[PDB]
Amino acid sequence: MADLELERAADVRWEEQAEISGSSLEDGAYRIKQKGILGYSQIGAGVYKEGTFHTMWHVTRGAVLMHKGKRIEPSWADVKKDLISYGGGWKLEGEWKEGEEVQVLALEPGKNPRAVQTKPGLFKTNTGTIGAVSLDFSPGTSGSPIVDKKGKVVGLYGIANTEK
Numbered sequence: 001m002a003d004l005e006l007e008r009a010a011d012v013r014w015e016e017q018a019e020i021s022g023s024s025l026e027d028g029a030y031r032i033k034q035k036g037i038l039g040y041s042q043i044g045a046g047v048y049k050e051g052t053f054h055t056m057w058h059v060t061r062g063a064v065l066m067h068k069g070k071r072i073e074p075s076w077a078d079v080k081k082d083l084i085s086y087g088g089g090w091k092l093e094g095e096w097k098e099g100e101e102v103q104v105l106a107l108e109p110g111k112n113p114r115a116v117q118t119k120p121g122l123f124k125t126n127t128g129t130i131g132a133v134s135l136d137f138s139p140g141t142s143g144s145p146i147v148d149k150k151g152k153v154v155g156l157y158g159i160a161n162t163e164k
């Protein structure tokens with residue numbers, strides 16, 4: 001069994017003094033790490049909202065997560081959407097405007113969390129136009145929350161559904 005733990009990184013809030021363009025228990029953004037022979041390694045990032053943990057399926061792979069002294073366990077997942085919810089139903093209903101700029105709360109493995117302001121690229125799909133946020137970040141950054149101007153989570157770094 002892989003020893004997967006989550007650790008709180010910071011609060012999830014829109015950053016007003018944020019850098020624009022592209023230079024590339026408790027609510028918040030968590031690092032997802034598993035204990036190794038050398039040490040822990042960061043494999044993903046998750047969003048804690050309303051007592052439910054949200055992360056990418058590929059990061060967790062369905063494995064049980066250790067938070068504090070309690071084991072937090074999966075409730076729902078979608079492999080096609082690469083989404084997994086722990087302890088409760090998916091709580092992230094936020095949608096992108098399609099026109100407004102967004103901030104990515106990044107969590108490079110081994111790096112302070114930072115908010116980066118960028119405009120997502122818009123591409124058509126059979127299921128309706130989608131926004132793509134692609135930057136030069138490590139893999140372990142996967143699951144990093146994408147927030148709108150209201151500070152709601154509109155996407156996970158990996159894919160930004162827009163509703164208008």
Ligand SMILES: NCc1ccc(-c2ncc(OCC3CCNCC3)nc2-c2ccc(-c3cn[nH]c3)cc2)cc1
Nearest residue numbers: 056058080081082083092127154155156158159160161
């Ligand atoms: N690992 C990155 C990744 C990115 C997007 C998707 C993805 N692929 C296909 C797809 O089809 C749209 C369906 C929606 C339900 N009707 C059937 C078509 N969707 C996605 C996707 C969309 C949104 C999100 C998402 C991220 N945060 N919140 C939702 C993740 C994956 C899968 C992996």
